[PDB]
Each structure stands twice: as structure tokens, then as C-alpha cells.
């Protein structure tokens, strides 16, 4: 019911036979011309390999399609992707804080595995 590239609701959906994932026609035709492969599974796919109604009620107050609707579409495109670049930069910083504290905890267990077993071994030697 949706497209698996943009997140649209497609008007002419097409499905690929190598991996069954429903894509909008213009977006999947653009990908095969760029690099001739399926975007999801990275398998060989061509334009001839692809295999081919939605209602949107226009608002009662439909000038606004030129002015007010079109500015809000290119505002919401601009602000979201910039906030999404801000989302991708923060996680790669939080990836670094994850692995460093992970490797810090590995050195704790590596240090404490030598501490515990030798402390137990000294209890076994204490009996003699």
C-alpha cells in the first residue's frame, strides 16, 4: 500500500520479481538507471524485469495551491531532512560512546576474571 523507497502511497505501483517489494514506478525506474540492481536486496534487476485507484479529496479552499500549499511542502521537506541530518550525526557520536564504554567493561571483566579465580584458588591452597 506504500512505496519502499520514498514512503509514498503509489499511483502506479510496480513490483520486482527478484525481491517482492512494491515500489512506485518513477522511483524504481530511476534506481535501475543509476545502478542496475534491486535497492533492497542488491540483486540483479532491470526495467523489463518489473511487473506493473487512490483518491485524495482536495480541500474546499483549493491561489492556495500556488501560494500556501506549495510553500508548506518545501518547508516540510527542508526542515525534516535537516533535522534528519542532525539525527544521523548524533547517533554516530552515541555509537562512539557505546563502544568505548563497552570496551571499558570488557577490560573490567578481563581484570576481574584474573582476580576472582585466583582468590578462590588461594582459598583452596589455604586448606593445605
Amino acid at each position: 500500500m506504500l512505496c519502499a523507497i520514498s514512503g509514498k502511497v503509489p499511483r502506479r505501483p510496480v513490483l520486482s520479481p527478484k525481491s517482492r517489494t512494491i515500489f512506485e514506478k518513477s522511483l524504481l525506474e530511476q534506481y535501475v538507471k543509476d545502478t542496475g540492481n534491486d535497492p533492497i536486496t542488491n540483486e540483479p534487476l532491470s526495467i523489463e524485469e518489473i511487473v506493473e485507484s487512490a483518491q485524495q479529496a482536495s480541500l474546499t479552499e483549493s491561489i492556495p495551491n500556488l501560494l500556501t500549499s506549495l510553500q508548506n511542502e518545501w518547508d516540510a521537506i527542508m526542515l525534516e531532512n535537516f533535522k534528519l541530518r542532525s539525527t544521523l550525526d548524533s547517533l554516530t557520536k552515541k555509537l562512539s560512546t557505546v563502544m568505548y564504554e563497552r570496551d571499558a567493561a570488557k577490560l573490567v571483566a578481563a581484570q576481574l576474571l584474573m582476580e576472582k579465580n585466583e582468590d578462590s584458588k588461594d582459598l583452596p591452597k589455604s586448606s593445605q
Binding site: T60, E101, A105
Partner: protein, 156 residues
Amino acid sequence: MDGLSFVDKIPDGYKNEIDQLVKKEFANIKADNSVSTLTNALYTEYLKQRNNKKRRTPDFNDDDDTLFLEEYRRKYPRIDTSRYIPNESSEVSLLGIVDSYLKHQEIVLDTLLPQTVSNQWRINNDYIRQTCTIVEEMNIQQRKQINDLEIYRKRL
């Protein structure tokens, strides 16, 4: 690596104590054209490009360029009445059928929520049986150890 979760029934003070040990180790180790340039600049500035609201602004008894403006208002009203005439002919019916499409889409999301919920419970259910078995093996190991510590003192 082996930390029992369901078995270990671990205080919040132990979480603070272990985090200090981790923190002490942490202290030791210590593709577009020009449209992308405009979109990034507009979002960083947070400012939107202005649209033409001149058609709302037009006034009577004005010059030849504004005569073009008032005739533009006439073509917009004839288009607006034509666009309103299609909606009236369609009736709500057209708004009704798109609403039925939305309920079918919404139901598909709820089924994906049950499928993920069923699978995450199954992964937990397999883990819970392993933790209980790892409990008894550790408990029997501790009981055998406490026997040996007591016996070795008793023999000596």
C-alpha cells in the same frame, strides 16, 4: 558476557557501583544538484522563501500593470468556481471513499504490531527457560563448593 537477567532478582546501587567501575576505565582509555544547497541554507537559517501574495493586494483605479492584476483575479475566480463545481458534483462520496481506504491501511499497521509482539515474547520465552536451568547449575555448583570448604577444614 554471561549476566542472568530473569534469574538475578540486582539493586540500583549495584548499577551505580558498576557504572563507576566502567567510568574509571573510561577515564583511563579516554548527492544532489544546487537544490541541496538551497534546502540546507533555508533550513539552517529557518527562513522560508516568500510567495507572491500580490493577487490579494490589488486595488481599483490603478495603473496598467495592476490592470493585469485585476484580470488575473477574474481568471482565478472563474477557475475557483469551476473547482468548487467539481467538488459539489462529486459530493461527500469522494471524501467518503478515501476514508475507507485509510481504515484498511490503519488495520495493516496493527497486525504488524501483533506479529512483532508475538515474536519478541517468543525470544523472551526461550531465554527464560535457559536462565532457570543456568540457575540450578550455578546453585548446585555453589552447594558443592560450600561442602568442600567445610570438609577441608574438618579433615585438617
